[PDB]
Amino acid sequence: SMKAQSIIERLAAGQVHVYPRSRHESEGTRVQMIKAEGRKYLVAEGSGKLYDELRGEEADGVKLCELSHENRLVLNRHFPFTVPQAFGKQSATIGLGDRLGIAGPGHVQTVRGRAIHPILAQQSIRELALTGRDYKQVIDAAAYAVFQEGYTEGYGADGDHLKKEEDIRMALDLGFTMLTLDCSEQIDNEAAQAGESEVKRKYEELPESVRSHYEAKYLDKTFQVGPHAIHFDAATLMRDVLVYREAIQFMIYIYEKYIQTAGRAVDFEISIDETLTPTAPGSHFLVASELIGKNVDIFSMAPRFIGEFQKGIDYIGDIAQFERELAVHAAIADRFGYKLSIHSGSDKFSVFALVGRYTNGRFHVKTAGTNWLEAVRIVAKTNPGLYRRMHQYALEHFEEATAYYHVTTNLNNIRPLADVSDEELPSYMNENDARQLLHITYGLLLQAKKDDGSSLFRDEFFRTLSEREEDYEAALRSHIGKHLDLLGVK
Ligand SMILES: [Zn+2]
């Protein structure tokens, strides 16, 4: 309370940072956001239901409030623009995942004035587990970000890479507006790699009603998808049914059980991008045709594209072949009305203009870890001693993290820390292999502890990022801005 009294008095004296776009008003209560002693606060003043419902410390007629979950729910009630919204499938969206909870404002600053809608709250179940966070905090950070920046155009919240029904129920209960269904576990990858008589053999074990449905609809048929002809012979049809049928059934089951019944608009993304086999455009057509035939309302489809989309780096593969397949993938999406979704999209600069051109600007692209790597870059620039300790720890524990993310990192390409000066440490975050090293070890680094249980890096990491808040947000504006520019946004 003496802490709160000090802040309130210094605010009156003009000695406390006020976020200039954060001033809002509900009935007779004025609210703004400030930063004091490395922490953000809400400041409320003026009698009213908003003042009464916020929880904080009162001095003068002024209430100083922490950025708590409960106060976020109060802001949600009085300021609808702080509540996530669905967007539908006829616009551009970017997923702006934040593993740290501090990138929201920089993300908002980047999309302000651009023709794209931000999915500002986006984290996977694995990311929550590796960071020790929950979905309430992810939406909290996004809601406070749009309030801080006075961004009233609307933001979305994505329950990313959901697999279990309990997690889908949780996402819907917590107000998420985008639901990403990971169907990788239902894909029959051995059927995709098996020989072609064995495909015919496994196919013949299916019920005749199933084989009749697919053959009557696809066998020896040609579909005109714009300038692209998609033809199914028996061999391709049988393999497609074996690889995808169980996943299709799972898509329909989830849609009917949870999406159709949600009682509000939900953007439903189907994800098959973490498959071992690439999604052939013809297989994509069959999956979409079956879903659309069953009245499933799809926001986006995330196929596995030819080549590789690894974390932290640009595309691996033959970009001419990527373009040829993208042309058909994009035509299929246009035919059925949903958008293509690009996962592991950050730093894929070689594909962005193609994606923008072939989708006519109507896409979803997801990022997350690249925003963590920009925070690491700030540490390399401003706290080299901390960077060295984090980089060395990542080297020592890298194998644990490769169990969760598939990368082909060559540690032999990374200069030893003893060979690089403090001034040169930021150059690591421009290199493929060092970027992957730090990208995938975020959970191990954030949760690392000393023998007494205190944090090994996490507290000092957030301390430097708070001290360098303006540098971090300039870095996000520049880095995510480059993504949007190459995608052709606006
Ligand atoms: Zn994915």
The answer to whether residues 353 and 380 belong to one domain is no
C-alpha 161 – ligand 1 centre gap (Å) = 6
Resolution in A, one decimal?
1.7
The answer to whether residues 390 and 349 belong to one domain is no
**Number of domains into which the chain is organized:** 3
C-alpha 378 – ligand 1 centre gap (Å) = 27
The answer to whether residues 426 and 310 belong to one domain is no
Domain membership of residue 232 (yes or no) is yes
The parent domain of residue 429 ranges over: 370-480
C-alpha 374 – ligand 1 centre gap (Å) = 20
The answer to whether residues 213 and 333 belong to one domain is yes
The answer to whether residues 310 and 413 belong to one domain is no
The answer to whether residues 282 and 202 belong to one domain is yes
The answer to whether residues 340 and 381 belong to one domain is no
Domain membership of residue 448 (yes or no) is yes
In three state form, how does the secondary structure of the chain look?
CHHHHHHHHHHHCCCCEECHHHCEEECCEEEEEEEECCEEEEEEECCCHHHHHCCCEEECCEEEEECCHHHHHHHHHHCHHHCCCCCCCCCCEEEECCCCCCCHHHHHHHHCCCCCEEEEEEEEHHHHHHHCCCHHHHHHHHHHHHHHHCCCCCCEEEEEEECCHHHHHHHHHCCCCEEEEECHHHCCHHHHHCCHHHHHHHHHCCCHHHHHHHHHHHCCEEEEECCEEEEECHHHHHHHHHHHHHHHHHHHHHHHHHHCCCCCCCEEEEECCCCCCCCCHHHHHHHHHHHHHCCCCCCEEECCCCCECCCCCCCECCHHHHHHHHHHHHHHHHHHCCEEEECCCCCCHHHHHHHHHHCCCCEEEEECHHHHHHHHHHHHHHCHHHHHHHHHHHHHHHHHHHCCCCCCCCHHHCCCHHHCCHHHHHHHHHCHHHHHHHHHCHHHHHCCECCCCCECCHHHHHHHHHHCHHHHHHHHHHHHHHHHHHHCCC
The answer to whether residues 459 and 392 belong to one domain is yes
The answer to whether residues 246 and 191 belong to one domain is yes
Positions annotated as catalytic residues are 160, 269
The answer to whether residues 241 and 352 belong to one domain is yes
The answer to whether residues 252 and 326 belong to one domain is yes
Domain membership of residue 101 (yes or no) is no
C-alpha 193 – ligand 1 centre gap (Å) = 22
